[PDB]
């Protein structure tokens, strides 16, 4: 709903101390550990993993 | 590529003993453990988990 728990509305940044606002790899304002699977692949075993430094879910680079 | 390691081409079923062919929740011909996250959500903490009984990745029922 309304303001985000993670948002600093005077700066439009995450409140000081937290890492992010929302995302497959953002949970409770902080980054999930790098390596955490954020999506499984149809099938080759090339899954999309979290990076530890960003909120989004990266397409595994070993894909065309 | 070619025939699937998991496929029984005379029956067009998975070779006897295995569970599935391919899918986010299928790995080495077998079902991933129920509860295994197959996809993380933008943000509510309502992730899509594996079922243990199917190869696909289920939309979490707590979504509209």
From Swiss-Prot, chains A, B:
Positions of short motif Cell attachment site: 42-44
GO cellular component assignments: extracellular region
The keyword Secreted is annotated on this UniProt entry: yes
Residue ranges annotated for the Disintegrin domain, each copy included: 1-64
Disulphide bonds in the chain: 6-29, 20-26, 25-50, 38-57
PROSITE patterns given in the database record: DISINTEGRIN_1 (PS00427), DISINTEGRIN_2 (PS50214)
Gene3D superfamilies assigned: Disintegrin domain
Keywords: Cell adhesion impairing toxin, Disulfide bond, Secreted, Toxin
Tissues expressed in: Expressed by the venom gland.
Location of this chain's protein in the cell: Secreted
Gene Ontology molecular-function annotations: toxin activity
InterPro entries per UniProt: Disintegrin_CS (IPR018358), Disintegrin_dom (IPR001762), Disintegrin_dom_sf (IPR036436)
SUPFAM superfamilies: Blood coagulation inhibitor (disintegrin)
Family in the record: Belongs to the disintegrin family. Dimeric disintegrin subfamily.
Biological function: Inhibits adhesion of cells expressing alpha-4/beta-1 (ITGA4/ITGB1) and alpha-4/beta-7 (ITGA4/ITGB7) integrins to the natural ligands vascular cell adhesion molecule 1 (VCAM-1) and mucosal addressin cell adhesion molecule 1 (MADCAM-1).
Subunit architecture: Heterodimer; disulfide-linked.
Protein name (database record): Disintegrin
Organism field: Echis carinatus (Saw-scaled viper)
Taxonomic lineage of the native organism: Eukaryota, Metazoa, Chordata, Craniata, Vertebrata
């Amino acid at each position: 709903n309304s303001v985000h728990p993670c948002c600093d509305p005077v700066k439009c940044e995450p409140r000081e101390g937290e890492h992010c606002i929302s995302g497959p790899c953002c949970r409770n304002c902080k980054f999930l550990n790098a390596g955490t699977i954020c999506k499984r692949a149809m099938l080759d075993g090339l899954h999309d993993y979290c990076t530890g430094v960003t909120s989004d879910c990266p397409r595994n680079r070993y894909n065309h």
